[PDB]
Design a protein around this motif. Structure first.
Motif, mmCIF file in Angstrom:
data_model
loop_
_atom_site.group_PDB
_atom_site.id
_atom_site.type_symbol
_atom_site.label_atom_id
_atom_site.label_comp_id
_atom_site.label_asym_id
_atom_site.label_seq_id
_atom_site.Cartn_x
_atom_site.Cartn_y
_atom_site.Cartn_z
ATOM 1 N N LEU A 1 0.958 -1.216 0.038
ATOM 2 C CA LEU A 1 -0.160 -0.024 -0.037
ATOM 3 C C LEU A 1 0.683 1.301 -0.016
ATOM 4 O O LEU A 1 1.803 1.466 0.826
ATOM 5 N N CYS A 19 4.379 2.359 2.394
ATOM 6 C CA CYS A 19 3.923 2.277 3.993
ATOM 7 C C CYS A 19 4.473 0.971 4.422
ATOM 8 O O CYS A 19 5.381 0.693 4.741
ATOM 9 N N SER A 20 3.528 -0.098 4.745
ATOM 10 C CA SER A 20 3.563 -1.499 5.101
ATOM 11 C C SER A 20 4.254 -1.182 6.436
ATOM 12 O O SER A 20 4.142 -0.074 7.025
ATOM 13 N N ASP A 22 2.999 -2.892 9.313
ATOM 14 C CA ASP A 22 1.856 -2.537 10.373
ATOM 15 C C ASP A 22 1.086 -1.356 10.009
ATOM 16 O O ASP A 22 0.400 -0.616 10.779
ATOM 17 N N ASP A 24 -2.079 -0.297 7.420
ATOM 18 C CA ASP A 24 -3.458 -0.772 6.449
ATOM 19 C C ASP A 24 -4.317 0.319 6.282
ATOM 20 O O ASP A 24 -5.149 0.246 5.257
ATOM 21 N N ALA A 25 -4.193 1.323 6.747
ATOM 22 C CA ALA A 25 -5.170 2.637 6.533
ATOM 23 C C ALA A 25 -4.127 4.020 6.417
ATOM 24 O O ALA A 25 -3.877 4.389 7.155
ATOM 25 N N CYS A 26 -4.235 4.591 5.332
ATOM 26 C CA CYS A 26 -3.503 5.846 5.026
ATOM 27 C C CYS A 26 -4.387 6.975 5.833
ATOM 28 O O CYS A 26 -5.399 6.436 5.988
ATOM 29 N N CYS A 39 0.773 7.495 7.606
ATOM 30 C CA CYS A 39 0.118 6.402 7.758
ATOM 31 C C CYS A 39 -0.531 6.127 8.896
ATOM 32 O O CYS A 39 -0.009 6.513 10.169
ATOM 33 N N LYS A 41 -3.324 3.030 11.345
ATOM 34 C CA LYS A 41 -3.866 1.957 11.453
ATOM 35 C C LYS A 41 -5.376 1.982 11.157
ATOM 36 O O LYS A 41 -5.723 3.012 11.437
ATOM 37 N N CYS A 63 -9.454 7.986 6.650
ATOM 38 C CA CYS A 63 -8.467 6.865 6.373
ATOM 39 C C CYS A 63 -8.932 6.009 5.262
ATOM 40 O O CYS A 63 -9.911 6.000 4.966
ATOM 41 N N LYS A 65 -7.767 2.884 1.919
ATOM 42 C CA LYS A 65 -6.806 1.397 1.909
ATOM 43 C C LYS A 65 -6.463 1.403 0.543
ATOM 44 O O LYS A 65 -6.176 0.263 -0.110
ATOM 45 N N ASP A 67 -3.657 2.527 -3.056
ATOM 46 C CA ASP A 67 -2.248 2.990 -3.178
ATOM 47 C C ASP A 67 -2.388 4.373 -3.334
ATOM 48 O O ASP A 67 -2.931 4.968 -4.181
#
Length: 77
Positions: A1, A19-20, A22, A24-26, A39, A41, A63, A65, A67
């Motif tokens: 992501l 990001c990556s 831990d 999963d939600a920008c 970034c 969670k 938030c 998810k 790219d």
């Protein structure tokens, strides 16, 4: 992501980093003219886990998810 990461909350950042780690939600928190490209969670994506981590309050942490879902055209339009 992918996600836009910057050293400061500017309202015109154009950095694109993977990001990556831990993540999963920008997070695109726009408190008016200042923008926060960081970034975040999905579990801490609420009206308290973000406004508290950054010690902020008024804003619209959005938030996502996808790219690079944190650009200057998400909350607006």
């Amino acid at each position: 992501l992918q996600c836009y990461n910057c050293p400061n909350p500017t309202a015109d950042c154009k950095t694109a980093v993977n990001c990556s780690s831990d993540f999963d939600a920008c997070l695109i928190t726009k408190a008016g003219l200042q923008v926060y490209n960081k970034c975040w969670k999905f579990e801490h994506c609420n009206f308290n886990d973000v406004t508290t981590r950054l010690r902020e309050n008024e804003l619209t942490y959005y938030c996502c998810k996808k790219d690079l879902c944190n650009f200057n055209e998400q909350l607006e339009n």
